[PDB]
Symmetry: D2
Subunit: 288 residues, 4 copies
């Protein structure tokens, strides 16, 4: 299957000889400011090949029809990114921001606070480092791994802000499930964490519990998901990449962070449409 | 959505007042020895309410039609187990065995080898302990957490043996994806690992690489999945449960281990059918 | 597969011994006046066994969760009706009305105008006759077919009024497609017509063309669908039943008309939800 | 949605400016003699632009991966044909043949027997005529309709031979349903018949009943489908096209016959894969 998503179906098709890859995003609502720049830029982040929008858009706005795109087994990575880009366009309309970066490389793992990683620094970093104190070690560790004609794993951090509430189809299409599915699906990924993650297993209810009783939530141990639906809080997702199975990629977890973003994008933009008609009020409003 | 799976769709429906829950397994091939005992027994493992097969079976064998079952928001847990039971029946026909147990409770986390946990001991344990040296600490930790009117997290280990090769639909329905989706979807789950897991991120290619060149695979760092498809090796899956949000459940990760099994069951029995027609030879054989 | 629909999934499960059948409607928006009477009444139309709503509703309104129902291979017919009933509840909120009746029995086929069949008479008729001038012939034809220990076919007419515009997912989930799929799927059905039907094949563009240029549409040859999406006009659907393969059913096309309604109901209530997020404006409105 | 099918998903993407269209066939089993000629020829039948296979094939055989193809809102018709072509390749391996032709144009409707239409003549006809006695009238009727700057409807006949038994997922994915859905979905289609069709409604059980008791079936009133699953007999499908809404197309039902074939192809090749794992025996055989 080369298609992904319930309502916002993403499909990537290959092309032997690797001349170019391509994706199809179906399900995008009409009337969306199509920033073909933000698209082209995102594609430059991975392994950093121009994207050519074939349809679904006219006069700078989405038509509401399938948006075909071609960029010059295939290397799906390129497609996953294009598609995610497009989905971020619908996410911006709701001020939902998804960003990721490398916080661990080899035996070097930043021991900072989740909401303490420097995304500003990440954007300007050649490796998307989130801890400026270890940015030199990651590079060295990677370079060392390269020259040695070897590879090294990496730990990615994906944070999502401006989260709405109720995103996620409870029971068998929960936001964490979908996220886990899209992230584990990424090449080289061998583990996925949401919030406290593995550590939540070693805690007690009295320490993991996130209460509010008043305004918003106090603590965010949950990672931004409760019962499989988003609670409004930021999204704390961690994707761990194994070492790639100078040339080749001594640390694919770097390029992988860019893909982990695209995937989390597609999912969220997918739940966003799925949860549209979850309320009769919404529905009447939808039909005037 | 209360339905799950591509070809082997599992569906659970609730019943207010909690009188009883129910599930529907559609997609099961006809002619399968229906061990209604193995079903009833599995249901006794969780929180340890009789299962009443409504259809899909006749004269001890599956008819090939939807197998309705009723057991006395609902408590899906019971349903997920019934359904998984049924799927294990199809898995037995291929000698695929799925088993799980608790290896960590609170700050007590067994530091044994994956293929070293005692499943024999697990079966006889009231808490499915996989490390007999910590079985007393888990109990104590749980009891302590109970009396304190509090809860505690837990780390589950799911091992699958007799694995076939090629199970898993590459690209967007990979065996790890599906597994991650079904496991993260479980209540209280906040992390999922496959094989080396988070640790693979701190390794180097030269240490994670699983080679063979001759007979089977040497090392099993991959956890039994490569490229999203099973490679034959056992399945190393780890599900981390957070503390439940004497009465109540001071450690739902115990009951959760029973569910983590059912879910991994449904998935595997699902890929098993999906990968049926992946080869023209198979197909001709299928149609004589 | 016992599930039906894209967003509004209908699922019917059987029960050997025919003690009772059951259905599950998942996807229904929360906050919908649940008229359990209209449900119970519709069930009395077919072959004219009480319906017991198990969930999805609380205090007279839909919760937004799967609505389980049980009524006392199975006889799906009963389920299809229950499910359709529930879907009509969501359709009423938009004043979409779906009604059907028998207009042909055996060699007796009413030659009246589409928008001329008497639905008022149909409701009061024991056979849902739409042409009061042939109501005696249908009965006789049926009775004759009964006593003869034989069966007879029938032609059903389903009209849908208060149609919204844009219902239907263009390309491969068009409103006519879905309708054709749900109707042909009905037992005994061997033909399906939309509007002019077979006759449109013998016409010329200059006679089939439905223009407007001003207010609404002039003629309704299209049957209420253009390009696979509804245009606002009424829906003209015709389902032809073959003779059943005193006892037994000498003319199942009568009971079948009741089912043809339920099915057209499910579909429309399904496109209604699918077309919710087709517009960014709608979406923003949906999320306030 | 631009994707079609349960297991054999067909997807067509457009390209503004109409430079070219494209389709993706995912789900095709590996190891299938890819006759890129039969593909290119079929494309020449519609409106009678070279097809360029992008992937899914290597060394003349299908790899088992998505088969991308590009041919120079879009005009889906071209894509539907390419895709159907590919599916016929899998159908040939089971000697399932699907052929269609025009049997009615305007007020001229061949009154021959179903199994009496000349397909040999059809192949050589510029309009796929199935009744050589009316081939001059259809042409004239079409020409007349052209010069008049008008259009005319048409009646298509699709026959499928070498039918296997059991093709079709009972309940909500029956072979007739799928067929009705794929055919009604075609542009200009307003009616669909299976076997006796509308006429079966005017018959009596004693005349429609198809018995055997010995070898194969005696009569074929059913059209080759019973209970929603194929019974082995040929497939009798009729698709009625309305008049197109010298230039333009005065009778799109001609080109439409070529598409009605492709669609019936995709469906059958889809049920063929779906019904693979319907039997445990088949399954064991599939896995050796």
């Amino acid at each position: 299957m080369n298609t992904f998503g319930t309502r916002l179906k993403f499909t990537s098709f290959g092309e032997s000889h690797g001349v170019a890859v391509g994706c199809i995003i179906d399900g995008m609502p009409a009337g969306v400011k199509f920033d073909e720049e933000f698209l082209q830029n995102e594609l430059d982040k991975r392994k950093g090949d121009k994207a050519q929008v074939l349809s679904g858009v006219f006069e700078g706005y989405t038509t509401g029809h399938p948006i075909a795109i071609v960029v010059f087994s295939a290397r799906e990575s390129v497609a996953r990114v294009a598609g995610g880009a497009v989905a971020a366009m619908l996410l911006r309309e709701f001020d939902i921001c998804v960003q990721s970066g490398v916080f661990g490389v080899g035996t070097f793992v930043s021991n900072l606070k989740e909401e303490e990683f420097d995304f500003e620094f990440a954007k300007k970093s050649e490796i998307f480092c989130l801890d400026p104190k270890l940015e030199s070690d990651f590079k060295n560790e990677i370079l060392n791994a390269r020259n040695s004609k070897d590879s090294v794993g990496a730990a990615v951090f994906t944070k999502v802000s401006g989260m709405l509430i109720g995103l996620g189809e409870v029971l068998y299409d929960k936001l964490d499930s979908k996220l886990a599915h899209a992230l584990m699906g990424i090449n080289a990924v061998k583990a996925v964490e949401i919030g406290e993650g593995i550590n939540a297993s070693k805690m007690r209810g009295s320490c993991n519990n996130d209460a509010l009783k008043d305004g918003k939530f106090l603590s965010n141990h949950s990672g931004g998901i409760l019962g499989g639906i988003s609670n409004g809080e930021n999204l704390i997702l961690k994707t761990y990449f194994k070492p790639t199975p100078g040339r080749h990629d001594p640390c694919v977890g770097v390029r992988g962070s860019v893909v982990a973003s695209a995937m989390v994008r597609l999912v969220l933009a997918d739940c966003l449409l799925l949860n549209a008609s979850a309320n009769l009020n919404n529905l009447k409003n939808a039909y005037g």
